[PDB]
Amino acid sequence: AMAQEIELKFIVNHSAVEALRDHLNTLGGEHHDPVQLLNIYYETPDNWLRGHDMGLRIRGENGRYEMTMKVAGRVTGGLHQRPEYNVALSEPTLDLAQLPTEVWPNGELPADLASRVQPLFSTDFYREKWLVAVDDSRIEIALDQGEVKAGEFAEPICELELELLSGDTRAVLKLANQLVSQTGLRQGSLSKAARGYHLAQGNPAREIKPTTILHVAAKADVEQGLEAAFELALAQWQYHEELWVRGNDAAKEQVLAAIGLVRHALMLFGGIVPRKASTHLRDLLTQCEATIASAVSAVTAVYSTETAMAKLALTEWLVSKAWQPFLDAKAQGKISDSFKRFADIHLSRHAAELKSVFCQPLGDRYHDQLPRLTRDIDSILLLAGYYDPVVAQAWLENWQGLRHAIATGQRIEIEHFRNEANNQEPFWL
Ligand SMILES: [Mn+2]
Ligand SMILES: [Mn+2]
Numbered sequence: 001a002m003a004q005e006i007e008l009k010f011i012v013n014h015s016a017v018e019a020l021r022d023h024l025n026t027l028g029g030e031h032h033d034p035v036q037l038l039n040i041y042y043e044t045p046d047n048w049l050r051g052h053d054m055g056l057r058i059r060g061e062n063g064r065y066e067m068t069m070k071v072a073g074r075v076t077g078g079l080h081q082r083p084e085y086n087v088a089l090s091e092p093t094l095d096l097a098q099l100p101t102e103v104w105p106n107g108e109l110p111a112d113l114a115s116r117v118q119p120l121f122s123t124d125f126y127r128e129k130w131l132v133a134v135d136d137s138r139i140e141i142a143l144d145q146g147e148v149k150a151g152e153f154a155e156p157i158c159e160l161e162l163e164l165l166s167g168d169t170r171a172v173l174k175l176a177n178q179l180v181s182q183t184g185l186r187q188g189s190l191s192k193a194a195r196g197y198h199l200a201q202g203n204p205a206r207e208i209k210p211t212t213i214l215h216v217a218a219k220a221d222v223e224q225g226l227e228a229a230f231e232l233a234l235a236q237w238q239y240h241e242e243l244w245v246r247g248n249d250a251a252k253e254q255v256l257a258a259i260g261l262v263r264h265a266l267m268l269f270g271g272i273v274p275r276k277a278s279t280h281l282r283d284l285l286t287q288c289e290a291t292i293a294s295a296v297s298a299v300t301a302v303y304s305t306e307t308a309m310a311k312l313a314l315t316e317w318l319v320s321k322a323w324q325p326f327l328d329a330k331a332q333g334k335i336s337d338s339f340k341r342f343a344d345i346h347l348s349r350h351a352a353e354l355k356s357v358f359c360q361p362l363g364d365r366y367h368d369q370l371p372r373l374t375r376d377i378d379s380i381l382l383l384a385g386y387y388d389p390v391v392a393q394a395w396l397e398n399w400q401g402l403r404h405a406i407a408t409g410q411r412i413e414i415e416h417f418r419n420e421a422n423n424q425e426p427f428w429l
């Protein structure tokens with residue numbers, strides 16, 4: 001009853017726009033000159049639509065109007081997969097009765113919604129378009145430039161979208177592979193609406209989000225756990241890259257931590273998914289990490305080909321389920337078994353590593369064990385989700401305290417947390 005939009009969003013570094021437009025014009029597509037799109041998004045005084053990850057707008061294109069509702073979907077790197085429903089309008093006034101009932105979480109429009117919605121923010125941008133064919137798929141490329149604005153608070157729009165009109169998502173990823181060979185693009189996880197909503201709250205600074213325990217569904221198989229783990233790592237990378245490029249220098253550490261989590265997830269599932277399933281991905285991650293470490297500028301590091309290629313490789317690996325053809329019968333059997341049972345086994349494996357390494361004081365050699373400690377914490381974050389979160393986070397807190405204290409050189413706190421970590425018991429079966 002609902003249509004499905006699939007598009008890959010890249011934020012474009014402002015200085016790269018001309019070179020990008022030039023490059024797009026070599027692809028041999030059907031091109032359309034820029035058109036002004038004027039949008040007003042609507043919201044209640046109590047943030048009802050944002051609460052359900054839904055966006056309601058009226059779009060104007062030279063006096064022609066369209067109402068669009070998008071609802072909660074999936075965002076994986078730059079790839080937005082959202083159910084949507086579009087309705088042609090005769091003038092810029094909402095007609096909420098024309099939307100299907102499936103739009104609503106309830107199955108009925110709230111009685112006072114039309115009465116309580118107000119214009120919350122606008123987007124005003126010029127969109128230039130190229131239609132291209134890739135294999136048996138058709139893709140609309142859009143280059144958008146303008147503003148998103150909520151009263152006094154505005155920010156620039158400068159972005160590129162590859163929307164799948166029909167065919168396979170693999171085609172969108174194939175097209176993306178050509179474009180990230182030049183600098184100036186980064187995958188964007190924030191919709192224009194998400195940014196508008198944030199501006200409308202007074203554009204508060206975004207805070208670093210420490211990774212917490214992954215909670216996977218009760219009866220999930222190991223493959224579902226794997227997917228959730230990589231989704232989490234990619235989401236943490238996206239989130240902190242966005243904060244870093246917007247000026248939060250402390251977010252750099254968290255970008256590197258998220259890339260580390262990707263590596264640790266590959267190790268964790270390495271008894272099932274062979275190492276050769278991720279050779280190229282891991283090579284790209286290495287070059288990205290080196291670029292980030294030596295960068296003088298977040299902008300340069302984030303818009304680099306090293307970062308862009310690594311991120312696209314991860315997005316493609318995850319969305320295409322690239323591990324699947326590498327699995328022999330034994331691996332297929334193991335990946336289809338219980339994630340809960342898998343996690344209990346691996347919790348013990350990582351606990352044994354933590355116990356053997358940190359049972360004794362290490363003097364001046366703690367920093368040498370950071371990679372091991374970080375791997376084990378990351379692995380336990382991915383595995384501990386079927387237990388009481390208060391108990392499991394409390395157990396992890398001591399190891400996390402140790403890791404922090406080692407990283408910052410706090411001698412007293414190192415020994416404190418090492419003792420706390422060694423005195424606590426396991427929480428798992
Ligand atoms: Mn879009
Ligand atoms: Mn679109």
